[PDB]
Amino acid sequence: PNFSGNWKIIRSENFEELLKVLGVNVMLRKIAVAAASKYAVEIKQEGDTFYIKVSTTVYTTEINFKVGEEFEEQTVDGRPCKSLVKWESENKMVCEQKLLKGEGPKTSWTKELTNDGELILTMTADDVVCTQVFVRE
Numbered sequence: 001p002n003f004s005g006n007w008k009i010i011r012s013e014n015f016e017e018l019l020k021v022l023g024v025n026v027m028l029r030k031i032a033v034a035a036a037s038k039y040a041v042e043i044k045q046e047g048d049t050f051y052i053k054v055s056t057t058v059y060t061t062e063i064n065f066k067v068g069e070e071f072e073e074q075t076v077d078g079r080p081c082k083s084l085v086k087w088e089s090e091n092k093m094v095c096e097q098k099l100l101k102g103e104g105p106k107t108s109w110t111k112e113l114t115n116d117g118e119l120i121l122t123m124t125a126d127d128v129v130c131t132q133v134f135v136r137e
């Protein structure tokens with residue numbers, strides 16, 4: 001596997017519906033969907049250590065983790081969480097999240113590198129699955 005790359009989004013499905021489950025009100029959801037049309041993910045992978053930088057027009061966030069080792073990040077709607085990534089196969093990993101404070105929907109995400117060179121991200125909140133597809137710049 002080599003997830004390393006500068007990835008640009010080409011497709012985004014069910015993102016609005018994901019934000020709805022997470023309690024985001026409709027006007028902000030629409031504005032968020034619009035910001036997702038621009039967004040980029042930069043990955044540097046060495047072995048099972050990942051550096052991931054997610055950026056939109058006005059905001060950028062960095063995620064650092066090692067597979068199998070708990071780390072802290074934030075949920076999609078911004079609530080801090082404890083995360084743990086595991087491989088599910090050669091080119092797919094899955095992250096389970098646990099809220100640091102309080103309660104809410106069960107969230108998770110996955111990243112997969114397809115055989116045709118796409119990166120597929122999924123983000124889940126309860127029953128709702130958002131799928132986003134990226135290609136290398």
Ligand SMILES: *C/C=C(C)/C=C/C=C(C)/C=C/C1=C(C)CCCC1(C)C
Nearest residue numbers: 032035036039052054056076109111
């Ligand atoms: C491993 C790759 C990951 C975990 C990517 C995570 C991406 C996000 C949490 C994106 C969030 C966004 C919003 C919360 C609203 C603005 C648009 C996005 C898609 C950047």
